[PDB]
A paper describes a structure:
The coronavirus main protease (Mpro, 3CLpro) is essential for viral polyproteins processing and maturation, therefore, it is recognized as an attractive drug target. Here we show both Boceprevir and GC376 can inhibit Mpro activity and SARS-CoV-2 in Vero cells.
The binding mode of GC376 with GMpro or Mpro has no obvious changes. The glutamine surrogate ring of GC376 fits into the S1 pocket and has hydrogen bonding interactions with the carboxyl group of Glu166. The Leu of GC376 fits into S2 hydrophobic pocket, which is consists of residues Arg40, His41, Met49, Tyr54, and Asp187.
Numbering used by the authors:
A (entry chain B): 3 to 306
B (entry chain A): 2 to 306
The structure:
């Protein structure tokens, strides 16, 4: 079972660079709008506590350099929405895919197209942690790189990159510019909350193990959802929501193992450990595969 | 903790097509006016058990090949076989053909795979060519003709085309000249690989990545000679470390201030003592599928912990 990213071509065709002065970051070009982090308008001095409303009133369309490679796109309008800048340009991107902007929950996975100077560098899969941070590679110049999922022909953009926290983890916004988590776009030390294990994804991975015939951990017990949630919290596992129970439905149906029976199996693994045994060849419980990821990787779903 | 990163797949996505012969469907790679695909597309279920490919191919005409680029049929106007790959000349040039090369990769090197089904891209992930010439991929029925590649500037270097799954669940395939990596054959028979070994230079690169990310518990004050390291490495079915490998670890050694032979002494202790339930970069196992180049790409401008 490997992390698999979505094919990145539909997103590569949307990446541009945005420059104010000597500050360059990435933007997302959809139709005739370029979306990017608003801190492109900040200088070194502005960054500790920028007054973004005051910095933006001093900017005109002609102050923004938007480039698709070396090709300039003329800016014909600008506005700020939360922590994102929207630059209207005079050219509709002919590579614009069918798309949506979505706000994801903790535990949801997405692909990141890491970009520098508007040029795609790499693609990887990551998970939104319960503390609203992501673990992955973002270097200087990576801001405005996006996270996404693809369903059939349609790109759901869920993340735009803004900052690195002291622990080396990353924080950003949805494409409406609202941060995930209690973070703000200013050059100040900010701490993430204590992270927890993504319970719904551990359950998905136990279902994946059962599908592949690795089922030694199936016990003969059940639990209520409330009793499970109170025990899970003692082991720094996220409580399950009704939505989590429902998204496990397909794997529960495929395996014939009721969700609350799998919860009872996980509770015994937390209380007793694995006693030297492995699951899918791992001594560690994996929490960055969603129920969708398990079905996707076992069933060979494509996109176009 | 430290993630595998694939190359952006768009330049390859624009080359993927579907190839069908009778009821056998797989993927092809469309470059200029040629579609490259695994030759076993010409086999029925029965043929795949023990195929005489020259005999099976002479019984085929251009019209027996259905090539589809999405909805659009590409007319086949010529065919030839090069080792285990079929080359279908079509009457249309692919406008999305990138600058490209065909390369044969060395064991220990990494590449990105674009897994495809019915000519449609499904997923992208990083693989290493193992010393036993298998890859640990994710490939289902219909995945054959999926390719592996690296990208340098604008240029796609295609190194792998997918053909089969071994009984152990690992994967085997060819270069784009149709020559298998490893002692495998394109027949529906159970095939074992040679006993695999661990890619030593890649483990060392990953331990450097761990140190750069502040994960340092495994460092020690032993050093070793290269020869004495290699004696222990070989005992544990690790590949020998060459002076060329020591040289390519130079930049990571400079970044961390840990001499390559000091990192070798750390790895020797990990092999002899195990990890004792501890993790490195959140892994319970020593990872050998990042090259020094792969690590340098992610660690370049990182501030030392
Ligand atoms: C945007 O490209 C950049 C991304 C950071 C830089 C290093 N890795 C990243 O993920 N964001 C910032 O520089 C950001 C700007 C503020 C106005 C939000 N500040 C930030 O992340 O500060 C922490 C930091 C900066 C530079 C190097 C290491 C950490
Ligand atoms: C091409 O789409 C397909 C890919 C396989 C299917 C499952 N996962 C994969 O990677 N290749 C084959 O089906 C291949 C065709 C031969 C004519 C090369 N057969 C195959 O891999 O068989 C392996 C095997 C045969 C007999 C016993 C045990 C394993």
């Amino acid at each position: 079972f490997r992390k698999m990213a979505f094919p990145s071509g539909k997103v590569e065709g949307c990446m541009v660079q945005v420059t104010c002065g000597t500050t360059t970051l990435n933007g997302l070009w959809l139709d005739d709008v370029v979306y990017c982090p608003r801190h492109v308008i900040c200088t070194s001095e502005d960054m500790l506590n920028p007054n973004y409303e005051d910095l933006l009133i001093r900017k005109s369309n002609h102050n923004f350099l938007v480039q698709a490679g070396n090709v300039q796109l003329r800016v014909i309008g600008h506005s700020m929405q939360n922590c994102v800048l929207k630059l209207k340009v005079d050219t509709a991107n002919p590579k614009t895919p069918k798309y949506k902007f979505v706000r994801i929950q903790p535990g949801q996975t997405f692909s990141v197209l890491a970009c520098y100077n508007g040029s795609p560098s790499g693609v990887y899969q990551c998970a939104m942690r319960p503390n609203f941070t992501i673990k992955g590679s973002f270097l200087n110049g990576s801001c405005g790189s996006v996270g996404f999922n693809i369903d059939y022909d349609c790109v759901s953009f869920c993340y735009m990159h803004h900052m690195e926290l002291p622990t080396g983890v990353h924080a950003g916004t949805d494409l409406e510019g609202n941060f995930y988590g209690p973070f703000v776009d200013r050059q100040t030390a900010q701490a993430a909350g204590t992270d927890t294990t993504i319970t719904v994804n551990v359950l998905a991975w136990l279902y994946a193990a059962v599908i592949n015939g690795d089922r030694w951990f199936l016990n003969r017990f059940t639990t209520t959802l409330n009793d499970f949630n109170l025990v899970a919290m003692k082991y720094n596992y996220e409580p399950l929501t009704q939505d989590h129970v429902d998204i496990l439905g397909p794997l529960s149906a495929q395996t014939g193992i009721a969700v609350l029976d799998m919860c009872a199996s996980l509770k015994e693994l937390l209380q007793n450990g694995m006693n030297g045994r492995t699951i899918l060849g791992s001594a560690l419980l994996e929490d960055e595969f969603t129920p969708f990821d398990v079905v996707r990787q076992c069933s060979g779903v494509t996109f176009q």
